[PDB]
Design an enzyme around this catalytic site. Sequence first.
Site, PDB file in Angstrom:
ATOM      1  N   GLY A   1      -9.439   3.716  -4.105  1.00 32.46           N
ATOM      2  CA  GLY A   1      -9.731   4.858  -3.264  1.00 32.46           C
ATOM      3  C   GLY A   1      -8.548   5.767  -3.007  1.00 32.46           C
ATOM      4  N   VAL A   2      -8.548   6.926  -3.659  1.00 34.71           N
ATOM      5  CA  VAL A   2      -7.567   7.978  -3.428  1.00 34.71           C
ATOM      6  C   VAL A   2      -8.338   9.283  -3.312  1.00 34.71           C
ATOM      7  CG1 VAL A   2      -5.696   9.321  -4.417  1.00 34.71           C
ATOM      8  CG2 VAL A   2      -5.638   6.834  -4.548  1.00 34.71           C
ATOM      9  N   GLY A   3      -8.191   9.963  -2.177  1.00 36.57           N
ATOM     10  CA  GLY A   3      -8.914  11.186  -1.912  1.00 36.57           C
ATOM     11  C   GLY A   3     -10.396  11.075  -2.215  1.00 36.57           C
TER      12      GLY A   3
ATOM     13  N   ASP B   1       0.824  -1.198   0.000  1.00 40.24           N
ATOM     14  CA  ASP B   1       0.000   0.000   0.000  1.00 40.24           C
ATOM     15  C   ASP B   1       0.861   1.253   0.000  1.00 40.24           C
ATOM     16  OD1 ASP B   1       0.971  -0.436   2.544  1.00 40.24           O
ATOM     17  OD2 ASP B   1      -0.999  -0.798   3.434  1.00 40.24           O
ATOM     18  N   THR B   2       0.412   2.259  -0.742  1.00 37.74           N
ATOM     19  CA  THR B   2       1.038   3.572  -0.749  1.00 37.74           C
ATOM     20  C   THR B   2       0.011   4.580  -1.241  1.00 37.74           C
ATOM     21  OG1 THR B   2       3.054   4.782  -1.330  1.00 37.74           O
ATOM     22  CG2 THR B   2       1.936   3.582  -3.077  1.00 37.74           C
ATOM     23  N   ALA B   3       0.350   5.863  -1.099  1.00 37.62           N
ATOM     24  CA  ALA B   3      -0.575   6.922  -1.487  1.00 37.62           C
ATOM     25  C   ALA B   3      -0.918   6.856  -2.971  1.00 37.62           C
ATOM     26  CB  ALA B   3       0.015   8.286  -1.131  1.00 37.62           C
TER      27      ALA B   3
ATOM     28  N   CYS C   1     -11.537  16.106   2.259  1.00 38.07           N
ATOM     29  CA  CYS C   1     -10.502  15.385   2.977  1.00 38.07           C
ATOM     30  C   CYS C   1      -9.168  16.120   2.869  1.00 38.07           C
ATOM     31  CB  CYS C   1     -10.373  13.958   2.449  1.00 38.07           C
ATOM     32  SG  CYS C   1      -9.743  13.826   0.766  1.00 38.07           S
TER      33      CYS C   1
END
Lengths: 469, 469, 469
Positions: B295-297, B245-247, B302
């Site tokens: 799912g990113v932002g 997992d990472t951004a 947020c």
Amino acid sequence: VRFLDGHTPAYDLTYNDVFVVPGRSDVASRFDVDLSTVDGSGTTIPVVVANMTAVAGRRMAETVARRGGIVVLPQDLPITAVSETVDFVKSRDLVVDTPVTLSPEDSVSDANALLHKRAHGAAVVVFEGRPIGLVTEANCAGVDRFARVRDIALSDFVTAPVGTDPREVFDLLEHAPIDVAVMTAPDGTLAGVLTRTGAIRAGIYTPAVDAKGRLRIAAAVGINGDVGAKAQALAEAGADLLVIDTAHGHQAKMLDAIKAVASLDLGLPLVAGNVVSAEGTRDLIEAGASIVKVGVGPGAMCTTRMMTGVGRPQFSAVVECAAAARQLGGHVWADGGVRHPRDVALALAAGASNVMIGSWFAGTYESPGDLLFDRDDRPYKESYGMASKRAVAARTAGDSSFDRARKGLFEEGISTSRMSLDPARGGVEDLLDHITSGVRSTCTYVGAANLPELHEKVVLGVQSAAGFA
Amino acid sequence: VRFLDGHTPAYDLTYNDVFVVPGRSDVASRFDVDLSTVDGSGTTIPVVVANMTAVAGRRMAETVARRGGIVVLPQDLPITAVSETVDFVKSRDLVVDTPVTLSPEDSVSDANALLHKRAHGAAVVVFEGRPIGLVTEANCAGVDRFARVRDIALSDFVTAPVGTDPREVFDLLEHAPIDVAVMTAPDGTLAGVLTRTGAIRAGIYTPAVDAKGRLRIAAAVGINGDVGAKAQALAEAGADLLVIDTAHGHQAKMLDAIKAVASLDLGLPLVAGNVVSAEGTRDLIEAGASIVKVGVGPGAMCTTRMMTGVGRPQFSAVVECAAAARQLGGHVWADGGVRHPRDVALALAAGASNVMIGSWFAGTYESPGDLLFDRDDRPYKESYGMASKRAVAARTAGDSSFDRARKGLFEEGISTSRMSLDPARGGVEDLLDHITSGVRSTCTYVGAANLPELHEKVVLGVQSAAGFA
Amino acid sequence: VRFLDGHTPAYDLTYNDVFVVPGRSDVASRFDVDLSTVDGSGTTIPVVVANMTAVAGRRMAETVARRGGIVVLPQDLPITAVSETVDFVKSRDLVVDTPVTLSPEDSVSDANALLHKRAHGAAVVVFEGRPIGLVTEANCAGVDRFARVRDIALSDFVTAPVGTDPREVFDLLEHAPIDVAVMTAPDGTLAGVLTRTGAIRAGIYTPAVDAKGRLRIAAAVGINGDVGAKAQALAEAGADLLVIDTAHGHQAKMLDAIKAVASLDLGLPLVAGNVVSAEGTRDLIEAGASIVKVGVGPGAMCTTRMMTGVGRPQFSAVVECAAAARQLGGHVWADGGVRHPRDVALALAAGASNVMIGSWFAGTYESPGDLLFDRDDRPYKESYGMASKRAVAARTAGDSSFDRARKGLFEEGISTSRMSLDPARGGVEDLLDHITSGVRSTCTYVGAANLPELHEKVVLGVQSAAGFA
């Protein structure tokens, strides 16, 4: 710009109606991103400080220019003050910062008042130009108000010569009781101050300088009076950039002023605004403007939009104006109340070569205004928009009081705003790193190493208002 | 998915912009619904606990795995601690739960502090391994703070042997003054505890176990350092699932890490994320990932969306990613801040094989963090996102303080959040039943006996933002 | 005592009804006053700590004995615990103080909890007995709650050998970032800590020691059971002073207990109480008591005075009891809720050889109770009077629950009190200096170099209640 398939809204878009879709990325980290601009302003970061009396000061200009940004001075400032500020800014160093100098006979209240206009958190006591000690917060607090600086000054402090590597300074300050690292010239006199955070930032931000290696600075002019004379005087005074700004920039008077300034051929870029239409952008560019400001009544509940139904959402206006300018070979600037780094990132993605920041920087130590405390002891600083009512009244030159009052009757209220100051990030650099980190993260997400690639390979989308519930 | 006729919006959809239209149903009750997943994770319910330091503990892992879920351990945890936690989890029983053991010489404050980390509401005093009594809340309250456990302990309690049917235990506890039903091994020593609610839940939830009959557990890895070595070590340590997992998961570094992990051929499914685009899903799957996080932002307000204009509404992103994965024969996981059972139900209906829950479970007894009380005595527990600043700083290995501070300058604040704990449903199971009841009601409304039918025979619609006024 | 002419009130006097009239003085400063007592207790200051469970601890005893005072341990404490505490106190040094030792693997919450039980403001991390660093407040605050001591510990600290002059230590700490001056034995291991304030106090207060040069300490006994056996056991355990205390000390049971203890001839002074009458003082002295406690229901709104109309104003009772004891060749102690230094000064002027302080010292770091925070974050510690209800119930030995409940029915409530802790003077020494400064100022005003002269040459007056409006 590129939108996802099927996203063809029947309305203008704002910053809350769009998002950036991540794509394939080859950038390793944020530091591998180049934020240099190609608009000709010479800024190494896409940040410009607005020509607001409560923001555009001298300390603000120095601090922003040292970090790669640029600042535009207020247009109502006297020419002598403008020249003095330009000389002060261009006489500064690119690595060390000017600290606060306190006399040993000064009072404690004056000591802390002069201390709270810089982010270093300490002031240097000077006797014939040589440091004697440092005075910090929580040292002058809780003591007798009749006490003086010499009675609380700490004579033990860190000292290093000028020219020392920032890495060496940071390593030296690893066990220093006070993070300040005051620097002395080879003669012995004070020649600036350095801080571990400042030392770190010295290796990240490239200062913006002209051909002479001095920090750049800009000045603003109006559309009333002899615009050419003021523009020429400012150019001779040392100003690097000229900005012609008014509420409505598409009127013929602005075109005449732009033509007058361009006729002199000062050899500097011209920034004109504000317009939100492609036709206005084309007209301003053809008049002799290389950069066009964008943004008129960008907020749906702003003063301009409440008084008049005039305005446009910032995103679509920026997109259209940038497209027109690129078609004509120009550049645009994104004004219109930047409040979050998302605004800067989306403005850059839309096609803006630079971004203009106003009231956000008012609540900072470096701002010209004085620091105030509210009922809850929380610090704040007042804001007065582009200019105060007294400022514009004086700008109307010598006129009879009857005419001045008649003109000011229709003028709205001062609309003063209390801009809170964040204790954790009260410094201007403490906001610049925030904004630049946001922009660099945006670039890494998109997969672009510089702003032109950010604009070229960006994919956007549209969202409804149901996500804000 | 299927939408009603005429519903072709010109924007991406979120969970607030959609609803499920009821259809013909043949399911009698909620209990006639099978919640088993087909993603290969082995979970009997569509719930996965996020790899967050403030949530993914050992008690949390045991409690969730006993009820059919799975938990992913933080990626920054030491290998020895990971192995110890895996052994502890796999050494537990599938029916009885580990109670709190209190020494008779312990203090009242320590007694209640050790009591409040489990949902049973009681602690067992142990002397040489045999129970002597039970101490509960409102018994240690209002007494002298200098008192000890033996001075308030109640020697009368219910006892049953291990292997007793849960129905028999529930029937026995019908008149018990205390609902706790501590269980003793045939030797006589403590071998777990049971509760009437726990006994009931034992007949509803099927525990998730591996081929050896032991509770499953997962571990996380980063993209820095020797990813293959850490993955192999975790696989040998007993981890059942590996998550990378990472951004931003669409960068080439993640592809390289996925290829490196897949080359070793550990024989375990790989979960990679996060992406919101079909292209990213295809690239991650082709790299050797069987499960893709999404799912990113996802939120419009947020931290990621405020710092950068990067993100995507969760519903449309999940739909597109699930479609791409099914086209490629894979599966997806729905991350992005689940807060209501509606989120889980809509994520499952959109095509997600499993759902990931983060900060919601932080405000629970089973979470690793310590229980705190606010100004209004209302309990709460702090949250620190994926990891704390100290955690990432240590994760950056051995580096000079200058480089560490330089890297952390652009890093945002800790963004700590005070997650309130609901007194009525403070236990983790008290949220699991809530979520599962919501999902089962959704399935009954749609008319599906299992998740694949839920995805196949679901009809959705679109609503405007005027319904939220 | 001497009163001004015409002051012959028709009522008993309290501390609010009297004042000391200044007289001719030859004392230069406060430091020229000797506060040694002549009651035989060996205290160099007129301060005694009451035998209250919430006050009389081990750290409290050490701190008070190092500064010249004495402490009486609770009478309900087990004999083994009493012996352990006596050995711990007598094993301490007269110049350096025992710091807080923290393991490097301990948690931040445990770190600050163990830190807040001493007034030094710092804790020493110990590995095999050698210091590694110091952890202070505001260093463990604001960080991740999952962090450990080693991640916030500061490895730079001041170190000095044992036996160093306190003046040298104070001079060394003039520029030290942390005022703590941890001291290492010649071997290298920790052998105590010193502080600049502690170094200064080392030259003002003379520690109270016995013939062996060890700090003195006292223990209390009741009137139930074998009083002689407990008294002999405590004497063999190392106790220096014995106190026999009960609500009503003039009853025949107290006389029998005093005779029993005096028959053994332990060679230690006996303190008995409490009485407020001259007849009671004479009876207690003739029974074999050298010191008599005074004070029963001294407050007009205290619990004893509200429950029963029994009591007496402290000033007149102390005067009469002291006169009777001096007539019989004894001494008296002034109990009865000391709250201001005025109380101590007036008690000494009235004829009391020593003063007893109770609940005032409860709100201190050195008290055995744990530190608590209220709704307004203001620190406080609970108080439970002489003993808690559980304490007396256990003191009633092994009795049937029926008899215990029957005896406790008439017993009043716990009457727990929340004793606030002053942030500026939270330490016990920070109250001892206050009280001693008050007493020394009283002595200088009177013109007396020691307590006997203070009692001999004091002139008092009477004031009405109209001055309190």
